[PDB]
């Protein structure tokens, strides 16, 4: 019960979770691009000049 | 004023048979002088009376 000491440690080891692998897809995913307006079909001439 | 920050004082109510009318039959409902725009830039009351006017001539609201 004397509990006498020891000598110096020489290396610690930690122990942690590993990294978070397969989370990220290799290609990204973006936010699609919003269309260019569009001329709707079906315009035509619904101003006749008058008499 | 405007939907584009150029405020105008009511000045003179012009009697409907002295304004210009165009060739489609119509009076305009307000002038607007072409000297508020050079020093003000406001391109954006340009596109948006060809927009409202092609809006109104199509039953379309406009983006």
Redesign the interface.
Known sequence: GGLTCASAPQGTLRILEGPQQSLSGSPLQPIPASPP?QI?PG?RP??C??G | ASRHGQKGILSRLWPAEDMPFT???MVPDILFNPHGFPSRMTIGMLIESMAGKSAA??G?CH?
Request: aromatic share 14%.
């Open positions: 307006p709707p315009l619904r101003f000049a008058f | 060739e489609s039959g001539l199509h379309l983006d």
